[PDB]
């Protein structure tokens, strides 16, 4: 909804013990709402004090390593757990299953405020880096600096500054630092297109998002029906199960100063693509927006195609 004046690049963020499940239907990469909440907490922590606002996230996922295993007689997978401490009677604990993972991801952050006006870009990038090197991203700790001495500093890049050809050249030289990983976008239009061409047989919507992201093996008219990209399920956001509630009227809230609601996950389709396949690097920024008259609390990435 708002085109950023600049982009900051969190260069190579390594994360240990991040949450893998993140949804009652998916288990792979965590939800993009975690990254939107990351930059909102970053704006709350260091963004406000610099006359800077932050709006969206671009995520590329350089590497993944799930703590899973395959149980030797089956084609499915189980999660590796932790040994929680004993109960007060010293008997045992109750096993609740959580799914841990290790991540290598880079972040693309949009800026609208007085970016190069009040402060130079290098100091802003350095203290935003120093702030993000003290928190945790998706349930798991941001792993700090190791013998990776090279990938430390950021690149605060002004979007609309310079000539348009020079704009393409600096965004290409920034894409040169985003080569190994594959960026993630939302594909609600492709979802609705396949929903409409599937509805010629039957009007069902969740069966589409089932049939979109599996290996459909069609008989010989032995082939595999294939999508051109990497279509995955994602948690698309939240839809309320309840009307609004006042800060005091619900017991055991996180705070008695903020309204509460009961919600459900909306699920949609995302897509992993190579970062060279997009020409404008501000197309990948995941914005989260609230429609509080109803339950529609969304993360997406509009202005992408």
């Amino acid at each position: 909804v708002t085109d950023p004046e600049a982009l900051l690049l969190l260069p190579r963020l390594s994360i240990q013990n991040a949450n893998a499940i993140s949804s009652p239907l998916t288990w792979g990469f965590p939800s993009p709402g975690a990254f939107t909440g990351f930059v909102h907490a970053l704006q709350r922590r260091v963004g406000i004090s610099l006359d800077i606002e932050l709006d969206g996230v671009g995520i590329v996922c350089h590497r993944f390593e799930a703590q899973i295993s395959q149980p030797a007689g089956k084609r499915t997978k189980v999660f590796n757990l932790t040994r929680n401490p004993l109960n007060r009677d010293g008997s045992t604990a109750a096993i609740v299953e959580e799914g841990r993972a290790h991540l290598e991801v880079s972040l693309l952050l949009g800026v609208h405020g007085d970016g190069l006006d009040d402060h130079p870009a290098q100091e802003i990038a350095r203290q935003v880096q120093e702030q993000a090197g003290a928190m945790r991203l998706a349930g798991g700790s941001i792993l700090p600096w190791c013998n990776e001495r090279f990938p430390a500093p950021n690149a605060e890049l002004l979007m609309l500054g310079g000539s348009d050809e020079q704009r393409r050249k600096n965004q290409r030289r920034l894409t040169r630092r985003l080569l190994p990983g594959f960026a993630l976008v939302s594909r609600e239009a492709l979802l609705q297109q396949h929903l409409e061409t599937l509805r010629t047989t039957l009007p069902e919507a969740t069966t589409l998002d089932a049939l979109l992201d599996l290996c459909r093996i069609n008989f010989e008219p032995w082939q595999v029906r294939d999508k051109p990209g990497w279509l995955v399920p994602i948690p698309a956001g939240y839809n309320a199960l309840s009307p609004l509630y006042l800060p005091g009227e619900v017991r055991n809230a996180r705070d008695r100063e903020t309204p509460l609601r009961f919600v459900e996950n909306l699920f949609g389709l995302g897509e992993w693509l190579s970062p060279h396949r997009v020409a404008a690097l501000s197309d990948l920024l995941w914005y989260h927006h609230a429609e509080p008259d109803k339950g529609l609390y969304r993360w997406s990435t509009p202005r992408f195609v």
């Binding site: 240990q16 013990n17 390593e65 703590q67 295993s69 149980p71 030797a72 007689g73 089956k74 189980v78 590796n80 757990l81 932790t82 040994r83 401490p85 004993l86 109960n87 007060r88 009677d89 010293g90 096993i95 290790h102 120093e130 090197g133 003290a134 945790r136 700790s141 792993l143 700090p144 600096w145 190791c146 013998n147 001495r149 430390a152 017991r251 055991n252 809230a253 996180r254 705070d255 008695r256 100063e257």
Partner: protein, 333 residues
């Protein structure tokens, strides 16, 4: 005032997954290209060794059970046959702001908590807890079984302020025992550093590397995974070691549990050694919970007496509840 219905303390002292590597002694200064210790598989054939029931002492049945072989596949990890030194490396960040909860439903309870921990820092610094954490980094307690029977353990801690090393500590981890808590000038300087990191006066980053001299080709002991059984199915591999990118590793929570083994104030004894800090302080190895709620020495009633009832406990119990604040947790009804 009452307890807040939610209470959530983010942990401080975040460790990394400690990776293992191997090499020779007196090359440990050049130990940056040391190759990783990898996880192999092997086969074991055992016998019947467990306790039999009183109904199953029949000798013909015992022989008939022996004559069926018992075979397992086991993940193992060894040193190479020309290396005698295991190198275990992890990073530990100290954050600071140990008092603030991540979630509190009651505002006045969180303000009373904030001034309570503020008065606790004003009464004395973190130097007791910081000196005990620096002890647990000084002696190699995070080498869990790798320390046992080792010839010589040696710990190097690098405080890294910028992209390069700010300061270095060098310790003989076998002189510093696991039982008592001494005082040493380098150790007290590290204690000042980690106390200043805990006080919110900075964000301390540490790289801890431990060298244990075990022997040529001997067995090392990384963490084991938790695999729940596929019961009505085929037999599984009966041991699975933890590995990060084909390198044998210890879990992060294992290093964290080794770090906070500071509690020498549990009421049951004092010569059995320090234990890890947790509400109803319970060690899994003994299987028995010290600091029971029927006595008034567990964490919850001590916190309620200090905050809600304003009955300040003794200074070692304030150390204990402060360590449980640094440890983090999800408390509430």
């Amino acid at each position: 005032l009452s307890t807040a219905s939610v209470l959530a303390f983010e942990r401080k002292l975040d460790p990394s997954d400690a990776l293992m590597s191997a090499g020779a002694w007196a090359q440990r200064d050049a130990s940056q290209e040391w190759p990783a210790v990898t996880v192999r598989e092997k086969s074991v054939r055992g016998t019947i060794s467990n306790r039999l029931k009183t109904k199953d002492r029949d000798p013909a049945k015992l022989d008939a059970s022996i004559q069926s072989p018992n075979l397992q596949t086991v993940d193992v990890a060894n040193l190479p046959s020309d290396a005698d030194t295991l190198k275990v490396r992890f990073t530990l960040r100290v954050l600071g702001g140990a008092g603030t909860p991540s979630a509190c439903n009651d505002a006045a309870y969180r303000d009373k908590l904030l001034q309570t921990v503020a008065t606790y820092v004003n009464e004395q610094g973190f130097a007791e807890l910081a000196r005990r954490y620096a002890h647990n980094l000084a002696n190699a307690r995070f080498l869990w079984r790798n320390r046992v029977g080792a010839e010589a353990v040696e710990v190097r801690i690098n405080h890294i302020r910028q992209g390069e090393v700010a300061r270095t500590w060098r310790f003989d981890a076998l002189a510093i025992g696991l039982r008592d808590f001494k005082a040493d000038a380098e150790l007290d300087a590290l204690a000042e550093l980690i106390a200043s990191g805990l006080s919110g006066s900075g964000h301390v980053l540490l790289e801890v590397v431990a060298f244990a001299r075990i022997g040529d080709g001997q067995e090392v002991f990384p963490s084991q995974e938790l695999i729940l059984d596929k019961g009505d199915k085929k037999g599984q591999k009966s041991k699975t070691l933890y590995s990060v990118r084909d390198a044998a590793a210890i879990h992060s929570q294992k290093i964290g549990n080794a770090l906070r083994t500071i509690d020498t104030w549990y009421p049951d004894e004092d010569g059995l050694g320090p234990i890890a800090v947790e509400p109803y302080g319970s060690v899994t190895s003994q299987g028995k919970a010290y600091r029971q709620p029927k006595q008034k020495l567990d964490f919850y009633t001590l916190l309620d007496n200090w905050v809600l009832r304003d009955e300040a406990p003794a200074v070692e119990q304030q150390h204990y509840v402060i360590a449980n604040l640094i440890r983090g947790g999800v408390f509430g009804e």
